[PDB]
Structure formats: C-alpha cells, structure tokens
Nucleic acid binder design. Sequence first.
RNA 1: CGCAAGGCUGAAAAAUUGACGGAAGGGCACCACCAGGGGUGGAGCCUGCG
Lengths: 46, 102, 33, 96, 54, 389, 49, 57, 243
Amino acid sequence: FIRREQLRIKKEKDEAYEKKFKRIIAEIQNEEGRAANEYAREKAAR
Amino acid sequence: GSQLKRLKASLREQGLIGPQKSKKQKRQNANDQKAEALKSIREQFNPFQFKTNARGPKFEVTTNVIKGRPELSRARSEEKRRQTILVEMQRRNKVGGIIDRR
Amino acid sequence: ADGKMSKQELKVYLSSRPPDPTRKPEDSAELLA
Amino acid sequence: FGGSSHAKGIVLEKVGVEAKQPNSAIRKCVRVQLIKNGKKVTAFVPNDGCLNFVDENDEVLLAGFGRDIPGVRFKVVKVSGVGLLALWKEKKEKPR
Amino acid sequence: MSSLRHAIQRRAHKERAQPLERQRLGILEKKKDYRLRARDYKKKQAVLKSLRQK
Amino acid sequence: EFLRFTGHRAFTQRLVLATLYGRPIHISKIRSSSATNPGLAPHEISFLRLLESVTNGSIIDVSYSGTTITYQPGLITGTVPGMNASLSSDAIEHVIPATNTRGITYFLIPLALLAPFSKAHLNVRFTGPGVITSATHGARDLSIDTFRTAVLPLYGLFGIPPARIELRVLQRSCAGPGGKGGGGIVEMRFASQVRLPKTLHLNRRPGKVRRIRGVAYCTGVAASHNNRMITAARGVLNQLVSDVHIAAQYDPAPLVAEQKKKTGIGFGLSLVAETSAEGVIYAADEVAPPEGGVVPEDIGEKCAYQLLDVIAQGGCVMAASAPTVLTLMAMGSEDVGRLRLGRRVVSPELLELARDLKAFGAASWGIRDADLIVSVKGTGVGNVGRKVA
Amino acid sequence: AELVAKRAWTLAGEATAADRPVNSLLGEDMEFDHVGKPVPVVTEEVSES
Amino acid sequence: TSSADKNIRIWGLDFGDCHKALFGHQDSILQVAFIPHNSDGNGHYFFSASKDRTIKY
Amino acid sequence: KILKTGDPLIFSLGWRRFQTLPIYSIWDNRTRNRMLKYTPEHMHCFGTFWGPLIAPNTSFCCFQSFSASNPGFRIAATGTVLSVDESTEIVKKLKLVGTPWKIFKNTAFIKDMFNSSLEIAKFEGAAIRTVSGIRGQIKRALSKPEGYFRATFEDKILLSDIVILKAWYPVKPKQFYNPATNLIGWQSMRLTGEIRRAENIPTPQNPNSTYRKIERPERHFNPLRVPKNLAAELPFKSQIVQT
RNA sequence: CGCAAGGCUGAAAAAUUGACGGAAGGGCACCACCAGGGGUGGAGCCUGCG
C-alpha cells in the first residue's frame, strides 16, 4: 500500500511541478521578448 | 450441465426470459420472490466472487459453500490502510493534537 | 419575470470567484486566386 | 530603458526559487520593479550562489545584459549599495 | 560560467576505498571499473550472438 | 491558558483572535445553566477540530464536564504537503456530524478572516452530513452566496485579491428535518496570502444606493418558488430602484448517509445592494423555516423589508460584516484606520469584540462624528510564518 | 553529555546488522525510493467496472 | 395525486416535494382516496382506481 | 573555525541575546532539505533552531563566546531570518549497507544488511544500489539464514561490491534555549572541542572512513571462449583456426 | 477573450426481419462411456490463498 500511495503522490507532484514551471518560463520569456522587440523597433527608428 | 444452459434454465423457471406472453397470459398471471431469486442467481453464477474448496469437507460430520470474499476483504483492508497509513503519511510531522476527555 | 439578469451578471455573481469592488470575391485577380 | 544606463529597483519576488537544476535560467531570474517607472521587469543574478545573497525588498541596481530564456535584458549589478561581484567574492558585508 | 566559480567550487571530490576489514576480496569496483566490465562483457556477447546467427 | 475568558458569546471570535495574536486562552463556564446539554455544542467542537487541523503546534484541551476549554495557539500553516495533506494543491477534508444546527457560513467567516495570514494556501473542503449552506434560522447565519458577495469584496478592498480567492459549492443544502441536517459540500481555496493588510478609509458618504443584485435558491422544490420570490422582491423594490436583478438557482436534492436519504429541502433568497461610491454593500437574506411551508411571496417581502432596514440603518458596513472588517482593521499595520459606522449598527457582539481586543492587547478605538467614525489603532502583527523570497 | 557521547545508530551514516539492534527498522519510520510498477490488486470497483 | 399519465405522485405538502413518482397502471388512473382513520395505525395507506380494471392498495 | 551542527551558538536577533544550538541544513536540490554536519565555507546554508519567533526578513548575528581572550574576530556568522514554523522536517541520509553473499548472473543474495524477515518484509520492493552504480531491487526475504535477502540487479554484481540502501531519516532539533542575561550572570554551554579538551576524550575517527589512495592495476580481460558445439557447428567461412 | 454555461425538476425501443422452446438427425470431448494408470486427501515441514 505504501508503494502504491507513494507512486501516485510522486506522479501527481512531478506533473504539477512540471506544469507550473512550464507556465512560468513561458510567461517570463513572453514578457521579456515582447519588451525587447518593442525596444528594438524603437531603436531602429533612430 | 453447462453454465450457459443452467443459467438459461434458471431464468426460464424465473420467467424472465420466457416466450412473449399474450395479453391473456398476462391476465392469467395477474390473477395468480423474484428479487431474492435473482440475487441468489447472480451470487451462484458469479462464483469467483468467493474462494471455495472443491473437495468439500474432509470428514463428513452431520449436525444442525462460501469460505471468504477476497474482493470484499481486500476493499475493507484497503480502506483500513487508508484511514491509518495514509493519515499518518499526511501528518508525518504534526505537533499537538486536541485532547478530548468526555 | 425579468429577474433573468445576464450572462455577464451570472459570470460576476454566481461564479466561484467573488465579485471584486474595484471595477465598474471582388475583382478578377482575387477570384482567380 | 528611460534614458539612463543603470536603473534602480525593488526585488519583488525571486521567481523560480524552487527550480531543481542549480544554474537554470529560471532559477537565476529575479522579478524586480523599476522605481523610475514603477514598472515590472525581470533580471538575472549572475550565479545561484549569489541569488542566495539577493534579499527581498532591497534597493537593487541593474544594467544591460549584453551577449536558456533568451530575451531577459537586465542583470543585477549592485545590491543595497554594494557591488554584487564583491558580495559574491565575500569582500564586503551587505548593509541592511 | 567558468569564471563564476571559486577554486573551492573546482576542488575535486575524493574517492573512498574498500574498508580495511574487507581488503582481501580485491579492489572496490566504482563507476569507471564498472564501465570497463560492461564494455568487455557486451563486446563478447555481441561476438557470440553473431556466431550463433551464423 | 494564561488569559481568561468566560461565556460562550462570540466563541469563534475569541478563538480566532487568540490564534492571531498568539495569546494562550482559557474559556470557562460555557453552558452552566443548561443541565440538559451542558458544555460544548457540536458546531463548536467541530470548529475546534477544524482549527486544530489547519493550525500546527496548537494544543487544545476540553475538560471533563466540557464547560471549560484551554487553548495554546500554534501557527497558521495551511495545507502543506509535509504536514496537513499529501500534495501542495490537495484539499484538506473536513467532516462535521449530523447533529449540527449552525451554518457553514458561521464555520466559514472565521476560516476566511484567519486565512490570509497563513503560510501556504488554504484548500479546505467541508463535506459531511451536517453542512447546511443556506441561511439558517438559528441566530440568522448568512447563506453561501450572501457570504461570498457580501464579505469577500471587503477582502478585495483590503488588498487580498478576489481574483485569487476561490470558493465553490458543489451541492446545496438547507436545514432539513429539524434544525439538524444538511448535505451540501463546499470547498475553499485561498490562494492569496498577504504580509500586512492595508489600512483603509471608509469615510466618504455612500449615499446613492446604485444597484441591487441577488440570488434566489431552491433545493428540492419547483422553480415556481424562486420565480414567485422574484416577483415579490421586484414588486417591493420597484418603488425605489429600477435595476434589481436576482438570479435563480435550483438544485435537485442532497443525499446523506445514515443507505442514503435525501435531506435538506428548502428555499431561500439573498439580496445585495451595491452603492455607486465604492465597495459598500448591504446584504440581507431569508430562508424558509425547515418544517413550516410558508409562502414564498411572504419570504420575498420579508427579505426585501430586511434589506431596506439595513439600507436605512447602515453607515458603510452591515452588522454581519462589521466584526470581520474590524478585526482585519486591527490586524492592519501600526496606523489608524478610519471606518464609518451607522448609529444603529453597533451591536453587543461588536462591543464584545472591542472588549476582547482590549483584553488581548490590541490598542483601542477612538470614536467621533462625521453616523459615526471609528478609528482603530492597528497592532501590525501580520502573518507570523510566511516564507519570504 | 549527549553531545560528547557516541551518536545513535540512526544519526550515524552507515548502519548495518552488527551496529543496530534486532528489529529497529520496525521501530523506525523513514522513507525510501521504490522501483517498478506494482501489480494492480483486483477490487470490487475494478471488477464492477 | 393521480394524473392521466398512468401514474401518481406522493407530495410532502410542506414545500411541495414529490416524495415519490410511481407508475403503477397500464391505463389512466381515475380516482385515488386515502383511509381517514389512523386509529388502527394505517393512516398512510391509499387506494387507486384505474381504467385498466384495477384497484391498487 | 568552521562551525558544526549541534554545537551551541549565541544569537543576536531582535533585542534578545540568546545561546541556542541550531541544526544546519542544505536545500538539496529544492526538494528535501537535507541535514548537513558542517556549514559550507562561503555559502548560505539553512540553519534552524528553537527560539523565540521574529517576523521574517530580519537580519541577525551569531557569536560563539563573549570572551575577551579570543585572539581573533569574535563574530562567527551572519544572516537573515527566513521564516518560522513548528515541527520542522529536517532529513538526514541513512545508508543501510550490506554485502553480497552468493551472486548469480543477475539475482544476488545479500547478508549483512538486515536482522530479520520482519524488517525485510517491511522493506520489500526497495530500491537498493551498489557502489559501482548498478541499481537494483530488494525483492523477497530469504529463509534459512535469518536476515538475508534476495535482490535483482541490472547486471552481474561482484563479490567485492557493497550494496547500499539510501533512506531518509527525519531529524528534529533539540529545544535548548539559554537566555544570555549578561548583566546578571549566565551559564554558557561549551563547544565540542572545548568539551573534549576538558574531560580528555579523543575525537572519534574511523580508519574505514579516512581517505586513502587506491591502487588500480590495469584491468585486462580474458579472451573470448566460444563453446565447443557452437564452434563445431558454425560454417566453413567462420570456423575458428586454433593450432 | 467569447461560445459551450439557465433546472415541468427532486437516486435506486424496433419487428412483414422479433421472443422462447420441442422432435428427429449428425459431429466432437480422458471437463464423456469403456480399460488401466497416477495424484491429492493418512503423519511431519513449509511458500501461498481465505
């Protein structure tokens, strides 16, 4: 029983962790790249 | 007899599978139980629900067959393992509990 | 009756989230393409 | 940014503090709030051994990052008035 | 990077040894010795499998 | 065990303030006159169990006769995967017995105003036989939708963000056979913790009551009950307000274990009046009596009357939400906070709250005129344990 | 006295049969990794499904 | 309550909850009546006369 | 000097000066909060003690002894309060170490690791590991010698190997609290080295534990040894020629 | 972001082709006959299952 319970816990925990940090990496990359492209366009105009 | 043939014979005796009766036959029946019968039929024709010995008793003694439900026993023991082992695995490191003396 | 509020008002009130207070074929070229 | 070279800011939250691999870019990144604009940007601490140094709500100076998350533009140069490389090299003690 | 770590970061980790109460049995097999054994045995099994096919 | 309280008035408020300030308490002489069922009530002991589950390091001791308890407080941990649940996102289960008569909102207001000072999130899931989610007759505890759209906007005013509050019912229940009964399950996911609540200023007059929105719920009866209640409420309030809008919700029935039985049939209504000024809202509600079978027209008229009374009475907060906003005011930073009460709104429960704050060690309240302005002095404790990053 | 005394068998790093007492693992509660997927035991819910 | 839908309902008469819908006759159930005296302990018994030539108790 | 866990330390934090004994810990890879035994040189490690609570983000200092005879730099450690809790979850590695007894091609019996079939049936299905890197699994208790067991490994382990099992044992700090009432007088707990120099006990050491140099001979293998029937049966193109 | 996402409601058929049989006649079966053989079941050991 402890084998089954710890396997289920480990699977769900790794799934939740992977999903959350996939979200966080994508969001930070999105915001930073958007600002970098805006600054590149505002710099190329000079 | 086979399982299929015995099951069909039992259902024809129970009247659940018989030929399509007429309105006159329905009147005769309404002029002239099956729940407990059907539960016995499902219990006896799904015999792997419970562990059974084929030889019977070793020495016949007369005075006045299931021998355990492994699925029901496993579900009950798993529920007990829930309420004890999973509970302590959640409260592995938990200090202080309510002291109820009543 | 006219108590039926709105899709928006249901989404504000009967939702799980509590309602915050801080809101108030023209041309031939295109035909051939 | 702005017209300046080094902008000040407040460390809002060390996002990615619970990453597994030690030198991951999400581990190193720090979300800050530029004071001159009140804006939210994200900056890199040069090593996880110095992410240990950066503390929350500290006047953090940051500059450009010229060269795993391509696009983070800023990197942390000073913390609370002390050079961050000197902090990591254990030259000065961080004034709090 | 490579200039962002101290010499104490770069300091090598020592390799433990067989306990002295068990030195008679030979050398303690660590990862490199294990890889040597795996390459040798896999090569011999490969040649024996090709001979069996033949 | 050091600080001393008596009586059973505002029992949960005494427990919650003891937990927040960390001052160990001893409540004696709970039910001394009632020899029939002396000592603790079942909702009170279920509240003790809930607080002990959410906390950590709390040692609660109920005496033999049960007319006196002691409480040494721990810390507000929340649902951490090491100690309270298995996952960081796993709902902590809480079951309360069938012999409960008070409402889940009476269970829930202390949990909500003790939530945002936690370490991790709160994922509390109330199930069990005795979970009534509607209004109760009792001492007139609120309903779930009343509680939500009538006090959680206040946390939104404090800065505890309502985008990350999360409260959802899954089954609805009224009282049922007698005062006991229930069946509905709720769950509550406080995903928003703060360090120090913002001190606030309810001072500007909330004159023009702009709009009125609400809910009419039925659990087990036909939809004609809510529709007649809508006609009642709109016929009473159309003399004054043109935009009254009351949704209708219908749930089949809740099922309770003993071989289940369907319980908790009832019907009720909850009204909210929102002022044009700011987060100022007047709420009222009414539930059918659990064995009466009275007119839904009469219930609509009765609840509209109660709402209009709170309209004519209240300064900026209603009487049911006054203690929560005041204890969060006191939880605020080391500053004065400026609340505008109405003259009719001050209650013996509120005066008892001020007494308990003075006893615990929070500073006092200065009262003046502008309805009357109370100015609280916050202590600035904040959440004790929160992993700073 | 506790600090100068010899450490317990648990707080030592390498515990074996000659070190610890007989059923001290039964006395203790630790955690460890597992391997392989265990076989799904038949339950009444699985059979009914 | 007996309808022409060949079925009857038992309602609780407080809040009007259908205690049970029950279909019991092959045709339209015409008349339904209780027995008034509970002094035998059987006040919750009732007969139903139905157009398929049946009384059901 | 480096500073050991369990050793006393006088903390200056808030207004209070108080001598307590902490438990040092690393946050291994953001998973498990492993317990250390010495602080790492020039690194922020997680300490943990039993004392009075302070709201977080409050910095603080750490001395070892308030004596003037100290020839250098009385201040030992700095830092900031991270959070507070009750019932910490400190975790220390326990290595249950055995030895192979009989070694088949894959399965191997292991002797000096367990004392009874009870303990093995508790640790059934466990993830055992050799020093060489071969993973493996404790599968089933053995019967005739009480305490031995069967493990299934990846590839053939050697009689020179050592089988380890890496479990995580929970450690809880001790709840000591001196107050350092310096104006009135107070008892200062001595450290480890001072205790040993006082009551004349040598520091414990294991000759199995000290680092030494290993002498690795150049591992040469036996040549291929084809079985007789196969070498007789394969065709003429690949028949081995051995004079 | 929008739709999905508003409760005459409150747990336990088709058929011109369909339903169930009966009597006769075949074929197969060490779960059948026939001829023999061998286990288990007696005492002790123990894995396992209930």
